[PDB]
Each structure stands twice: as C-alpha cells, then as structure tokens.
Amino acid sequence: SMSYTWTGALITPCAAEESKLPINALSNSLLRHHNMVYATTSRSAGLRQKKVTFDRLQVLDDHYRDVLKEMKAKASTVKAKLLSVEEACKLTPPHSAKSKFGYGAKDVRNLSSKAVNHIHSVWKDLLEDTVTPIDTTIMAKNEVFCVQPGRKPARLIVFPDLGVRVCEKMALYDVVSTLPQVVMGSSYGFQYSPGQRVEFLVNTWKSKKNPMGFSYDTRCFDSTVTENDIRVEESIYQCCDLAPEARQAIKSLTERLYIGGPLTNSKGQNCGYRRCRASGVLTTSCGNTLTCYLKASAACRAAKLQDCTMLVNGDDLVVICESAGTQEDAASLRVFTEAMTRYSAPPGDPPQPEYDLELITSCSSNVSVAHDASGKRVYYLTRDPTTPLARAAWETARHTPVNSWLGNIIMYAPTLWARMILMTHFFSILLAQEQLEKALDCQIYGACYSIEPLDLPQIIERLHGLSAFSLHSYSPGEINRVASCLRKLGVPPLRVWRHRARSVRARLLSQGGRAATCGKYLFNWAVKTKLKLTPIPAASQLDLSGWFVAGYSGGDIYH
C-alpha cells in the first residue's frame, strides 16, 4: 500500500520559521561564512512529502520467519510492568507539545488533576475501543545544516496528543526500555556509551580473519515500514509477561495508532492518511531497531555473509563480516540488498564493502585513532564537524529547546574539533553570562537530559575515560577533514582557539571548585606545561542510570 495518501492541505507551522542564520555579537568569533548555514522550514515539506510517498511490496521468506521465531523466543523471557499515570507523567519533557484538551506538559509534569483525569480517560478508551484510528499531528522539523553544493527539505514528525503519549509510556515504556537488549543482545546499539561502542566496533573488527564491513542506508526507513512490520512488532511485545491491561492497551495502540491513522496539520485541517511508521511515537526507536535487525539478520542469511555481526540503532545499521575477497563481497552485498529490498527496506545509496574500519560511518560517526598521556594508542569515534558547527553557530544566536552543542561535546568529547572549538566557545559564553551553574537540556539517543555544564568532566570521564582529556597526535585524515571544514565555514584557525582556551581555562581556574575542575580537565590540552590529571573524585556518586539503556527517538522521553 502507499506509505501516505495526501489531501492537498499543507503542512503548517505553529510559529514563524527562520531559515537564515541569526547573527549576534558572538557569531563571527565562531564562523564567518553565514550564508552557508540554513534551517529547514515547513515550506519545504511538499518536497519531503513527495519522496516519502511510495508503494510498499513485501515478500517474506523462511529466513525472515526463522529469525522472527528466534526473536520471539527471547522476547518471551521478558517480564514488563505498567507504569502508573504519575510515573509516566514524570517522563514528560517540560517542553513537550501541549494537549488539544486544555492542558500542557507542565500540567502533566506537576500532575494537575485536569491532566491526570484526561489521561485516565484516554487509557479507559484504549481498553474499550481497539479499532478507532487515533488522531495525529504532522509537523515539519526545523533542523540546521550547511549548504552542500543544494538544500535538504524539512523532515516530517507525526505524533498523537499528549494524553495518548502519557498512555504509551504506561503500557510500553518498560517494554521498549528492556526488550531490545534481551532480543538483540550485543547487536543492540543504544546500550552503549561512546566508549563501549568504539570498543565493540574494534573488537568485532579484529575478531574477523579478513574483516569486511558496510553501513546500510535504507531510503526513508519509516516510510518502508509496513502494517505487517508493525503487527509483527506487536506480536513481539505480546511475547512478554505483561499485565492484562498492558496487553489490551498495546493491542489497541497498535491497531489505532502504530499501524496508521489520519494526519492533521497545526491548523486542524486533514492532510491525509499514514500507513507506515509514525516518527513521534514511543515505539519508533524500538520498533525500527527490531524491524531493521530482523530484516538485516535474515538478509545476511540469504546472502550467505560469513560470520555477520550486526550493530543496530533504530534504522541505523552497520554489518561486520568475513571477507570472501572483493569480487564476492560485492556480489554478496548485492544479494543482501535484493533481500532487504524484498523485505521492504530498499537502499538510499547502495552499500559498499569496506576494508578499513575508519572509512565506515555508522551513527553518523567513524572510528579514528589518537594517542594519550603515556603514548598508549586509543580509538575514538568522530565525524565531519560541519553540521555540529553549523548548529553551534545557530545556537550561539538563538536559544534552542535542545542544545545540540552540548550533546556533541558529551558524545564527541575526545575529538579535536569538540575540544578545541565547541568546549572553548561555549564555556566562554557561559562565563560571560555567569551561567555555568545553569542546567541545560540535550538529547542523547532520542531522550532529553537536563545537565549541569559543570558536571561535564565527570560525564566525559565515565563515557570515554581519562584518555579524552589527554588525546594528541590525531590522524592526518582527521586533521585534514577538520581543517577543510574550518576553511569552508570560515572558522578561526586552531591557534586562535588555543589562545582563547587559555583565557577560558585561566578564568575557570580563578573561579575555583567545579569550575576549576572544568578548567583543569577540559582545557589541559591548551596549556604547554601540563598538569597531572587523576581520576575525578565524587564522580562515582552521580548515577548515569537512564543513560545508554535504550533509544527513544520521537518517544517524548525526559530524564
């Protein structure tokens, strides 16, 4: 069937949308080439609609059903619980979209009786009615990029009312938090810190006699998801040991929301109908991960890839296997792709075999190597810093709900671009505003986290190790990619950043306490006469539970 049917009604914004890079007094210290930076708006939604709208055909074979059976066997070992209304309410981001029924996120969060009453009413209706399609809003996402000589159209987000979103948590939060690791084991990617992911990638790579690897880019994964896939997902959820009410609600959410339903714009006009994955439901991450792992695991068998190890984060897939040499690897991957295509996950750009781990991009990241304090080689994950820096420029001039810069510093802390540019720039800004103590929101694996900037040294230590504060002798390939980015964007040379970082560090040191700790660890690279970095005390008090358990993209989750 068609992924979507459209009425002609337009996808509408809630507020005016800026597409041009806002400029303030801080902008130029980061980036001179402002016209290279843009944000998507709803006004390009028609271009997206076009490309996410196609017919899906699905041909399912024995490998498919075999893998599914294995997945269900493991799923049946999971026991999951219902969350109370209040438990589910506390998982709601403060900035979440408000209900059409006269209450908002903060009402939910502080448990107003108005919110809670509507929630209980939504739940009761889920138990009673397992057929009536549930309403969703379709919006365009405003995301920032750099011009790639041209522009990406806005992504679409499809989400049900707040009342329904709290109910999803009640029925499925424990499931989507617990099931994927039990079903998929070490192949489930959202369980890893950056440190663990690079560890798992390197160990996997060198466990092969002659390693070959490839990332598989599905063309618009969400759109490729069929009703079959979503019913198949539900059948996996139902293997779990669940309370009768959770079973009923899960069945009801599947039939009424997950499978499809009507699409309404912000003005309340009907825009059409969806028959593929909604990107803004609780099950998007878990559903996509299970479905990608199933199709890929079965496609590996069909292609006869040898010792194929998968790493799956939603729709993001990387496979590492044994080479049969270049001719056979190329033919293998074609069989893999034909299978995936038969399963309704055709590729965007065709996959290509890789023989160098560092040339493989997965979760928009590639492995690279640097050296630590004692010369002892260390692997870490990095990326082309263009988009992170284009977004950092936007966020320098505009207050954003989610600070991408903060998530990039957290996840890319060991990189030369994050240490030298992002750390230096934003700590300078926090200092000027005396907002070092001010807790800031960022999204990691789709979930929103409130973070104190001053806890960054502890956070980085836990996620990457001390190495992250002592890394040097980065690779010519990486150094060239950074330098090329700065040239393109008109970002000041690294000597300018080194100069600035010295100032930032000194200023932090002068401050004392946690701020001096930020000065010492984060900016030890800037000083020629290096200080000794010991393991950070009282770091092992702060619990990073909720971190690196599961993915929740589009799932309206707050920790």
Ligand SMILES: CC(C)(C)[C@H]1C(O)=C(C2=NS(=O)(=O)c3c(CNS(C)(=O)=O)cccc32)C(=O)N1Cc1ccc(F)c(Cl)c1
């Ligand atoms: C915060 C950033 C930097 C953005 C982080 C992230 O949170 C993600 C992600 N967040 S997400 O939206 O949950 C996500 C998906 C979600 N896809 S889906 C709809 O659920 O099917 C897939 C891949 C990756 C993601 C990511 O790729 N990242 C890059 C990255 C990932 C893992 C690492 F170990 C390192 Cl070092 C860097």
